[PDB]
């Protein structure tokens, strides 16, 4: 799951940036409203579907569809904020989604269930997992300070200058993304234990703690100081946007 | 018998309806002294039919009574804080028994 | 409670009463004051006061950035 969502999902959006957008600049413009419609429908529809999922992994996996279609919106805005934001969200998603899949994998390795209703009250038995689960839950809501907010807002800036309507529909991801992310966290970690389902617990071991550390450092680093990344991207991004026109 | 069980069930409903109506009364009156009179008028309403013997009349008197309580029930009743629905409910509850914490999980060997 | 005594947390858990909490608390106070040192020097070096105050102020001692932004046509 970590490889599937963190790397393999990026091949399509990378193919838009490497081949489709630069090579066919006239075709890109004619299809921008079409791309905007599909992306905006997907963000709204798949976020509402995520709300009603009952499987831990189904919720996290359904979340990626909403995030990648925000990435398409930014990259088809064809400005610096849009494309730069689309790349930054790509990398940030490859960190947040992988870590969230890692959090659920920790729970499934011990208890061998993915149903949300079986869990609950894990804060009193797994506080270290609960603290790490909460941080990556916040990073999935594009909270300022996390890496995913940098990509999310820069895309909304790029989309606003091209079409205000698509920026408004895309910004509804903030309301819906926060709804299911917090609902997931509270139903799993908060509340009371259910000893009829689960009565034996173990917090994260030394290996699991080390696994999460580079993820925590990665999101905070890009979240507060994204200049190291934007510095190395801007020339290639600028030439991608300018491709096909000469004024 | 069947008539005794059937009438015992009717008694239990009426006793509970009196218990809830008398608690709803204090919710509306708040003050003790107002509550005293409003308590007597409500008891004076159960006393009016206290001697009815027809079993099918009892069922209709109960059903009319239950819908009355349900219609004029105080919209914000008082609840003791640690009782269910109270402001102190489920606050710092005692941990359940039968919980085990495993050490040394996920070792490479 | 009972199992929470076998649960490790950074915040201490329910009813945390460490035996040496005073010496721990003072060690924390010395640390935070130490961290407050580099913050103050960076702040005093980074503060910018375009206007001279009507009266002398505590910051006219540790800060030397007063009335320096008058030629704002030269800002770049």
């Amino acid at each position: 799951s970590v490889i599937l969502a963190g790397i393999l999902l990026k091949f399509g959006t990378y193919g838009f940036l490497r081949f489709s957008i630069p090579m066919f600049p006239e075709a890109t413009l004619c299809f921008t409203p079409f791309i905007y419609t599909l992306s905006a429908i997907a963000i709204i529809y798949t976020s509402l579907t995520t709300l009603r999922q009952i499987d831990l992994k189904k919720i996290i996996a359904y979340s990626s569809v909403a995030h990648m279609n925000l990435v398409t919106i930014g990259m088809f805005s064809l400005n610096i904020q849009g494309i730069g934001g689309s790349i930054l969200l790509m990398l940030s998603h490859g960190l947040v989604s992988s870590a969230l899949f890692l959090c659920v994998g920790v729970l499934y390795d011990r208890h061998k269930t993915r149903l949300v209703r079986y869990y609950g009250g894990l804060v009193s038995t797994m506080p270290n997992f609960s603290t790490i689960f909460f941080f990556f839950t916040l990073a999935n809501m594009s909270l300022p300070g996390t890496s995913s907010f940098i990509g999310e807002f820069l895309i909304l800036v790029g989309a606003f200058q091209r079409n205000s309507l698509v920026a408004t529909l895309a910004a509804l991801g903030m309301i819906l993304g926060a709804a299911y992310s917090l609902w997931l966290y509270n139903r799993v970690v908060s509340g009371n234990l259910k000893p009829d389902f689960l009565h034996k617990f173990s917090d994260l071991n030394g290996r699991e703690v080390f696994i999460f550390i580079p993820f925590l450092v990665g999101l905070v680093w890009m979240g507060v100081y994204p200049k190291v990344f934007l510095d190395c991207m801007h020339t290639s991004v600028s030439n991608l946007v300018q491709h096909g026109k000469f004024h | 018998a069947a008539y005794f069980a059937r009438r015992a069930a009717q008694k239990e409903r009426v006793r509970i309806l009196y218990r809830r109506a008398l608690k709803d009364t204090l919710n509306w009156a708040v003050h003790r002294h107002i509550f005293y009179r409003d308590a007597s008028d409500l008891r004076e309403k159960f006393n009016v039919n206290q001697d009815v013997e027809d079993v099918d009349r009892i069922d209709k008197l109960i059903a009319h009574g239950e819908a009355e309580y349900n219609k004029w029930r105080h919209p914000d009743p008082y609840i003791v804080p640690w009782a269910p629905g109270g402001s102190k409910f489920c606050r710092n509850p005692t941990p359940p028994a039968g919980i085990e914490i495993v050490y040394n999980y996920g070792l490479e060997d | 409670g009972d199992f929470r005594a076998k649960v490790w947390s950074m915040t201490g858990g329910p009813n945390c009463r460490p035996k040496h909490w005073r010496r721990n608390t003072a060690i924390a106070m010395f640390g935070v004051f130490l961290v407050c040192i580099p913050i103050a020097k960076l702040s005093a070096k980074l503060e910018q006061r375009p206007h001279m105050p009507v009266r002398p102020i505590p910051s006219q001692i540790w800060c030397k950035n007063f009335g320096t932004k008058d030629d704002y046509e030269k800002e770049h």
Binding site: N128, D203, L204 | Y103 | A5, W8, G12
Partner: peptide, 18 residues
């Protein structure tokens, strides 16, 4: 001593190292 163990590993025997 604190409650629980950091990262849920039992300490080694006294005088020894993990």
């Amino acid at each position: 001593r604190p409650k629980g163990y950091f990262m849920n590993r039992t300490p080694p025997a006294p005088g020894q190292s993990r």
